Ligand binder design. Sequence first.
Ligand code: HEM
Ligand code: HEM
Ligand code: HEM
Lengths: 479, 479, 479, 481
Amino acid sequence: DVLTTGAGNPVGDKLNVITVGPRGPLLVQDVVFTDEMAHFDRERIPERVVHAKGAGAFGYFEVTHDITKYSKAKVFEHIGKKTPIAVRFSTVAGESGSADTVRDPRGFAVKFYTEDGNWDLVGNNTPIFFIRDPILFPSFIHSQKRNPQTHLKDPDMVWDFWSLRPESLHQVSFLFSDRGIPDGHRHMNGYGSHTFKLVNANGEAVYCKFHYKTDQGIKNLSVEDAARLSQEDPDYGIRDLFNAIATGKYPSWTFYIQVMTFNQAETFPFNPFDLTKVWPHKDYPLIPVGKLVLNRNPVNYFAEVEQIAFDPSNMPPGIEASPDKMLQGRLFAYPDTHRHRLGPNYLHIPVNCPYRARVANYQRDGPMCMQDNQGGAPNYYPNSFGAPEQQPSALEHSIQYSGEVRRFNTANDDNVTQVRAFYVNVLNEEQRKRLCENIAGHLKDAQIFIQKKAVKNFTEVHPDYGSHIQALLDKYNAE
Amino acid sequence: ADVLTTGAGNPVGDKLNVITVGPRGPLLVQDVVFTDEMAHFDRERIPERVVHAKGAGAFGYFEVTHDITKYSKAKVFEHIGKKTPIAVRFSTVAGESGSADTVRDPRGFAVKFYTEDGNWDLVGNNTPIFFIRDPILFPSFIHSQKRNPQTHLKDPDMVWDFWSLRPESLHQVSFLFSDRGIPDGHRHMNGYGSHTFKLVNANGEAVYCKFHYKTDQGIKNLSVEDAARLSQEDPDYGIRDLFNAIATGKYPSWTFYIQVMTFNQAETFPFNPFDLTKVWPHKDYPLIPVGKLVLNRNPVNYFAEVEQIAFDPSNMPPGIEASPDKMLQGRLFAYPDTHRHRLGPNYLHIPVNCPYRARVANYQRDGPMCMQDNQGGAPNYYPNSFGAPEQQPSALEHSIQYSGEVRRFNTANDDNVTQVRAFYVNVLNEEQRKRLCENIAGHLKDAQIFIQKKAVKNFTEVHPDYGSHIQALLDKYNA
Amino acid sequence: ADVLTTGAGNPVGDKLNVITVGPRGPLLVQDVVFTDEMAHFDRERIPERVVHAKGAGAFGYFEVTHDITKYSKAKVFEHIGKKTPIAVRFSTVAGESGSADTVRDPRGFAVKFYTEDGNWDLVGNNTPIFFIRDPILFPSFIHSQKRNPQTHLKDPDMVWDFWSLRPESLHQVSFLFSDRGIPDGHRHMNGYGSHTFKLVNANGEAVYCKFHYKTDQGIKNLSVEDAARLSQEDPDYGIRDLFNAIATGKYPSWTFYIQVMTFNQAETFPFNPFDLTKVWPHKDYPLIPVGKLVLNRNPVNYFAEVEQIAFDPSNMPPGIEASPDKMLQGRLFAYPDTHRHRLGPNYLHIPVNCPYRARVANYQRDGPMCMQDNQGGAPNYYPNSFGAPEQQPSALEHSIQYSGEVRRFNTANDDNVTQVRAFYVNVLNEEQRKRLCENIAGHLKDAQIFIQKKAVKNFTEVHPDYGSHIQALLDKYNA
Amino acid sequence: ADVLTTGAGNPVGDKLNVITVGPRGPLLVQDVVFTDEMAHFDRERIPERVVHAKGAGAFGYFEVTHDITKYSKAKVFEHIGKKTPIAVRFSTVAGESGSADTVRDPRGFAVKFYTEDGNWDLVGNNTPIFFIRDPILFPSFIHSQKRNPQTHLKDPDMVWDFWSLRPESLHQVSFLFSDRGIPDGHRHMNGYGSHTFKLVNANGEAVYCKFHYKTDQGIKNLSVEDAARLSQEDPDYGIRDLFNAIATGKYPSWTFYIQVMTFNQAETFPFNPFDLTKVWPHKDYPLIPVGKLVLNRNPVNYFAEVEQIAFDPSNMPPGIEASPDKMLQGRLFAYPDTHRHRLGPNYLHIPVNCPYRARVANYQRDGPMCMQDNQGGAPNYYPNSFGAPEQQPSALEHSIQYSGEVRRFNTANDDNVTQVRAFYVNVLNEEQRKRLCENIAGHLKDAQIFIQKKAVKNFTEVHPDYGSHIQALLDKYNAEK
Ligand code: HEM
Ligand code: HEM
Ligand code: HEM
């Protein structure tokens, strides 16, 4: 193989630079050096604003059951249908150099390359989240990140925000339970979290929840181990995933959904669209749909993992968004941030390209335009020259909403009920004790006035929750 | 007719109406179709070329007709009858993207050769010489030619102040204001590499050279009157003329020659052989026919194949190297540098720029908008024991020893008039000399009178009649 | 004089000769002075605006002359005699950065009011109406107005195939091809907010409005002949005229008025009061005097104060809000979006864009080129228990409840002729009608006949004489 | 409490709830308060430095304590007692933005002196030498120190394949694996310009030199164990230490020296004086005291003052110039180039990069995010008959003449063991050598065996004991598995 410059010019020697004499200065004509150096100098792009640390693999999605009565989406079109998928696992707060085995939620994004375009299901390992209004997401994330002056993690920031926004109770509980630190990516479940809308061939709609359970089973790391691992192998999650697939132990998840008719959405105790709530299985049981199988490792991490981009707004006919405020905000945020992190034409990047689909429209140009830019095809719509036409079949399902167009406060929607049921029913005493210790061990670094409001909140879920945490805190502050 | 889609390939039910709440209500964020299309339109523009922004493009090939292997081992020259695909871009200089084509200004005539040894870019224009002989005055030169930093208007004071303060411009200024100043479209003008380059053959022997490609359609210019009229009637006269031609099968071509000056002759040349304000008289350095340039294919999409194309003088395949000309030396850096800005870090992946006849292989990786496999998992460090791309000793550059110390050498002492008088008195006949003086006076008349004097003194240093006739004309205007 | 430095503040000894190895040797990399200046010159360009690229800017102030506090609580109108600094930019539409000013096209008349309640951006133009009334058609309309994607030439088929398939364009097209189509410079044209907006008073009561700013210098237009001559003679006519006036003290001004329409009146309105293709008859909704716009200072550096300026329709202070106009609605997103692309994430830090008479404070941080103290160490999350900025309830937005389903509502078939027939028959006299048909036909004749047919079909719909006369003229052209 | 606003300064009524059509309806585009804040959130990340990504910043001053004017006319040295404000950024090399501070790896030690003659950046590390001596191998070396291009995991075969095929590295490698590989915080390590620079006096006379700033807080390193326990307990240890130190009055300081080698001495140095893998023995070239560096102020906002800070070795004011050191010659280009990418064309306008103690005037204009007045209406072309800024001849660079032709001269074979043997036997005590061999074996034992052979091969060239002690260890390891 002949070593070349970016323009393909053979290189004579790329181990020594051109100089005027053996001990003289460097010359501009040594374009070989500059060409390489200039590229080295531009190797980095900005990391994801959140979920920066990640692992990636590829595979397919396979339909196992008929749910066409609910969704007309081609990805579900017929039993046994296989569609290629791209998956990206990740943590949340930490940046590119951080450890994988730390307490944090886990991203679990799945990209389906369907013939009706790509369908990005950007979920995580928890069915719920910390807040229910997108406008608090930047603040939340800031509080989870580094102090603006010291650039250090700040318990005060974390808990002042959480104590002031108690709706964070439900997810804060899930996050500090054993599931706060899964043993790798293959031993956790995935959830779309938000409520989405399914539409069938008949134009009738229903609301759903997406779920994909680990076929390898749930397995978590104790805090002792997680800590040891955060230092022995910060990239433990990446290694584990890549070695499994590499050795043929292809991990898979069983994909189900929960269905809620519009009526049920009403009789539902709470706001069905509040991200801090779940749909109790007992009441809305899981419906089998298919499998997700990861059977291929990336070849080039930067090209296939760092540059991949998932947009919740990527939804094909049969799948639509619900009124969930959080999701509504995510419809804008992802493409927006992608045009920034990656570039105006990031969808032309191989992994983000909707290759099983025929992309035709009236969009043109932009930096780094790679394709033919759709040749000389007429660029305005409508036109009398046979350019791409719109197709009615893919029209969105319309609903009539009532009320004024204003800001409705949801800070006071139920913040503790489901949290109680999870604390006293779902968990057992061990889990319950640990839950308290993990919270206590982290909250203890916060200022006391913050510690106090935090505990009041936990007390509202259950006096035992708060009081036991308060006990450990006392122990901690005793020192 | 194709099915209309979003960038992610999702079918669009209706792209003529936006989603609102009620027929006369606000716009919805979930109308992802609108945002997708709008966010792209919003990013359709990249920055124009800092200079030579207005252009035209066409494609074809270069075919070798004569054997010059004795001078250069470049593959593009390898054997007679050999065709090498080429991309060309014609352009003006000062004007920006919407300026008129038929105006006095030099003309860019850039040629890209997709050779097996990588791309070879010959970035030249319709003149053998330039206005200055040191790269460091180029930005100031261009500034003086563009708009006033405040009024944002053309400034004759900036134009002639700089020229009169830099008398080395006499030669090019004289060519610029001659009939050749406004070629009748790109098909009727010549092309030159202007700079002296270095050719190396298979024995390691080298000579200096000049590249010329004479228009096989013949020299044909526009009267200033016509030029003015077309600038109003058809600002893109050049683009249209080039395009109709090729589209109607009247493929324009140029005969490619080279002038050779041995290293010994380089010493005995009257002037500095590397001074860009000088030419190599044919009378002493005959044109040697080499091949032909033929443009037979119009671009399919202008943005993709013309606006985005990038030519780098540093792109020279084994056999062709740079000379110590200061100007060329400076351009060795400017182009890829500005290209990494205008197009992006990975601009060489954009199709028209990709060296597709070559086999690129190196240790460069990542960068924004990485398009290929990013060289997969191949070892990314050199040297290495895992058999990656090797450097080949054949392509090693020509070696030479130089006299003197490393520091800035004043070149304002170089002749500024000798060849100019030659051009004024011999090369041009009465008619022309007159239109020449008239063309200059019509532009210099607008400059402050003290500048007019500094300039006349220069035209006088060439020939007394040259300066005085201009002053005669100026006196009229100044009244 | 001042010592010449590199950008880093290092003194330059000689910036007229580059460092080379000997008088006739190659260029050195340690000539950082050269690289530094060249690297910057290489990045002077940024993308020009996607539309309204060719512009002229100035500065001045707004002064309240009358009292409208009963309609709006906005501080800028707070009390008679109150003055607010303004920034303004006039412009054409389709032409790119180097096009001619004196050509047929609408004219942007953007006004930035630097108020204590933050910047208020009134982005309007010389017409009260527009060609389309749904933002999703904009990119196509603009495309059809610019160059052919392949030949890169102005294309009459694209212009008329679009306008003929979308007759809602009739009104603004009749206005554009009338005398008002080519105002004699920026100072002799009116300014309009075009869109219907909403005003809110201190009591929470709201009304709809139209913004108007009539030229005190009187309406003056250029004949097509003059326009042509000038596009040739002086492509930057509009720039020079504005600049010279202010330079000599002939400060241009505009009387600012508003038309008011109560919500009751909004219901009874014959058309859709938020339809961008329609006006509110002065007879039924008279102009109410408000203040004065005065431009008394030219820019000192064009690139910094004009090219880099950015107006966002979504920049509206309390007392001023958006109406449901689909067009306005989309613009709320498009500008800050395109601005983050053309200028960058922190384009609001650029001096001309900074709301300097306001006290910006929030939880936003970082981003490319953060130019301030980035709000120091203040709490970067909301809410917080550390006295960081708090939302003030009085700035809440006005609440309305709309009726109907959330879906795309076709408006292509709204009224496209009535108000046009009024303008053609009532407003214009015969000299004007003649000239209008001549101007239209003169451009419509370059279009293919089927395109011509459909066009004349719509004009005939407005009035049999309008359509028939054009046809007549066309017949001569096709002959 | 100030009023909360959008980026355009418009007051925000409610920034805790978004606008929807009804309490259970979709989100509206007209809620621009939301979009304005969300849009910015979506952009707060810029590219991290390609190397030395993880860092810590602080500010203070440089004070002249001795007179070295006979060597340099640089104003920063102008006279005894003269103080010049400075900015410093410490860092590691390989790890990216979230990596741990306490890990074996060199440490960046950048100093920006805002002088009257412009800024002077002395971008050095905590070592006098480096792994390679030709800039064309730097990208390769860096790639080998980072993640596998496919697995994205650290890769020992990559690390050692490079170091074994490029033995010139032996010197700095022997240092990187010594106790000084993991300093205890940034306050207990030395600072070196490393490269050989050139000093010029008011007479035009020039000399070559080495800059050194010794830690007044004294040398101090972390044991491998603490370094690891720490990489887990506090991955930001270095930042916290430096910050608290300064916040509690423990302002850290360094003493600034220089070594001078005349041109005559230079032609007789047993090695290439401009070889980044060599040092000038203090015995033959005594350290000359010059001044002092003091860090007494912490940043107010890290992003603005630290992540956005940019140092360019090419930023040198009159009196200070570069030497023909191949490595340094390369960096003269890399930094401004990379900065244009990382920060932006006008990255010099960012406050901490601005040469605020100097008076910037030239013919450069425009570019994205032009923050200043863009030098108003001043004439933008040079020369001009309108007064605009002028070159001052006194600032002209020092000129030398070199012998030889213009080409690539291999240096892969210059001395690779001599100076290293000195360090191994003379400099280090028995204790140290053992720890050295151990820290090497512990990391190299993961590399393939053929890579191991070649690596040991070279260590042997430095000293039979060196190589055998490592091999001895490699065997036990390779056996254990
Ligand atoms: C030292 C002097 C010069 C410098 C620093 C220089 C710099 C530049 C730069 C930065 C560009 C922008 C390229 C792009 O953005 O694509 C440009 C374009 C161009 N220059 Fe030069 N130039 C110099 C002299 C000349 C001369 C001597 C000629 C003709 C032989 C010339 C012909 C062109 C042409 C044809 C283009 C169009 C390139 C393209 O389409 O990519 N320039 N020049
Ligand atoms: C729904 C249709 C419209 C959309 C989406 C839209 C979009 C745009 C965009 C993206 C720009 C670029 C601004 C920049 O780069 O700084 C722009 C500029 C401009 N537009 Fe619009 N526009 C629309 C309708 C109109 C209308 C109806 C008016 C006024 C009545 C208008 C007046 C202008 C002006 C004056 C500029 C120059 C702005 C500046 O100098 O910053 N546009 N428009
Ligand atoms: C030929 C070898 C070298 C090249 C081409 C090179 C290249 C680079 C580049 C591109 C950066 C990124 C700067 C930024 O993004 O702001 C960097 C950072 C850095 N380098 Fe080097 N480097 C080289 C050798 C070294 C050496 C031996 C030292 C010290 C003497 C060193 C110390 C640093 C430090 C401390 C930083 C931090 C700079 C900052 O904070 O702006 N590098 N280097």
